[PDB]
Design a protein around this ligand. Structure first.
Ligand SMILES: [Zn+2]
Ligand SMILES: [Zn+2]
Ligand SMILES: [Zn+2]
Ligand SMILES: [Zn+2]
Lengths: 208, 208, 208, 208
């Protein structure tokens, strides 16, 4: 767990994210918990020119390394880390289906049993606030109190997990759920959902 | 027909399934009939780290090999094998269009002549029951009595055939039919279908 | 213009067709005009196991080479060649958007100026008839009298041109037009179209 | 900044455009500002057979190099350059979502904060006029007066920027916004938007 290994995974996460179709051109930022703060992708530099030494260290006070410009969205990555002590990785993208659901300002309800991967019977949608602001950061910290993923109204998605592998995986799963919801919603509104008792069985089963 | 050749095809089936866009992140399990039970993919291990010796043998009594954890959905693979003696391979995924049709709880009717590939004038949708349960297993065995593919409400798809090649192929065909149905359904409901006499000509023709 | 060069292009056309997303699993057949009949893809054999010597020669009387089984849809390829003397290549697939428009039994009207690539102000839809029958063949020959592409109700698409390159290209263009029509149709019906005078200017311009 | 380096990027831009799914078969043309006119892709030649010496130089008077046929849509590339002095690269495609929005003849409103990348609170739609005409050229020059991207009714998209990298990037971003708008529009009309004050904060923030 040296710095450069963590920077290679961050870069590999951006690459896989783009290959999975979740990341569409210069949007998206990834981070990992490290020392007293985090390592995050830089602003500006396109994913394919990224090299290990581009990765930026931001400490717990919010100070970033000299000569590097962290992602313009770094503050809600730090919000995530202080609101969810168990989170070690944070993935953010503007994936098209998640973002369309966030434009309608709706939570994703329990239309599939995999909704439980993010911790409960829904994928919440946090209210709009300008990117990079303290106000956005507060909404995200409140939405992640009992969920590992949230939509951001008029914006995109955030997912957090114990490592980058699982955070990408979750991010991906919520984009599938989002696409499932939009496709069925164009046909029938509201969309049929599983009951809370049924999601409670599935959560228990996922613990086992 | 040694064990390792069957395990390479299983792994190759997961890979092709993901490349075809039918398998979206850690969902999906494949099996083949073998000896008195079956070889199935393990739970946990991501498709790309899979190696031949990861494949799990489950006998006819439901006992799995020592030190391996079979897919969490193995029971409906075994249900398939006892309900359809002619089936030698079973493919299961959560492909997005099939699953959206299963959220609406509808069968796919005869909107295209290829519906006959699964044996009749429809692609049925079996009722929801918690993954991995005996109750799910019974619904699947009843849906496969006269069809080689079925949707699973709020969940996904199962397809069975004489070998893995044909099972993947069928799985793929039902995802196309699913997408055809959802796209036309957003425009007109109900969707125009071919009559039963016409599907009966096509079945005879497919036998020849 | 020896046989094997024509068979490599046919095979290359199947490959490109699959890579472009127009051909989804074992559907689709391609042919070229040759001598007194045509070279067509065989039935059964999956596109990726195809080799030059798999290609089947069918003469002008409809007799096929010994030991080879031509595509199950060969008769409407021969219909195309006798109905359009200028056609030297024929491409058929079940591409998802074209086929969805053919399930609604509608022609594609002039929603984009590229509709003129197939010769007029529309992409017609020929009535359903069982695959491989004389009756299907007659509908296709009548739809291609003044168009180079047609939809086949409840089935798919046929496109013909002076060579395989242009036939694939046209096929592709009609799948785009199909997707344009379905996406706008879910929002507004009817969809705005360009007038016949405007398509007449574009045709003249395309001749120049 | 020699000619051949500029021709390699143009060709690389066509390739990336096709790989990103924005360019579907022989549509699309790219240009860069050069000397007193521009370098543009030729008409006819498919993107994959393009070589550096295929690139056509058109001077400020509209005269093209000897023995080369410039794109059939070159005139609105020249319109762009005279209407926006800061533009050094121009990308045009018929990307499916942008074009579907242009068939409905609607501007893309502020459904996402990234709408500000093209300079304001919208992505305008310029009125139809036959491809390659002076009349089309005038509409494009008026739509680009205060925007870096515009839709073309019944046709496609144009994007301009300081270099090819940024022009492709913008083009891509507008196709995402287009897809966001069509997907939400099928569910609710009108689609929720951010207010002008909010886009004004985002523009200021994007300047910083
Ligand atoms: Zn963002
Ligand atoms: Zn499952
Ligand atoms: Zn067919
Ligand atoms: Zn154009």
């Amino acid at each position: 767990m040296e710095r450069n290994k963590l920077a290679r995974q961050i870069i590999d996460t951006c690459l896989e994210m783009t290959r999975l179709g979740l990341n569409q051109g210069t949007a998206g930022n990834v981070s990992v918990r490290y020392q007293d703060g985090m390592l995050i992708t830089p602003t500006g530099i396109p994913y394919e020119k990224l090299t290990e030494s581009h990765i930026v260290f931001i400490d717990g006070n919010g100070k970033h390394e000299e000569g590097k410009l962290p992602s313009s969205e770094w503050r809600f990555h730090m919000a995530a880390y202080q609101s969810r002590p168990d989170a070690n990785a944070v993935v953010h993208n503007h994936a098209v289906h998640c973002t369309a659901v966030s434009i309608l300002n709706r939570s994703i309800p329990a239309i599939h049993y995999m909704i439980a991967a993010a911790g409960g019977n829904s994928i919440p949608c946090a209210p709009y606030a300008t990117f990079g602001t303290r106000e956005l950061s507060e909404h995200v910290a409140l939405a992640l109190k009992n969920r590992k993923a949230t939509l951001l109204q008029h914006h995109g998605l955030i997912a957090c997990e114990v490592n980058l592998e699982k955070a990408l995986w979750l991010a991906h799963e919520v984009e599938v759920l989002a696409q499932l919801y939009l496709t069925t919603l164009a046909i029938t509104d509201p969309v049929p959902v599983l009951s809370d008792e049924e999601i409670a069985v599935v959560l228990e089963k996922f613990k086992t």
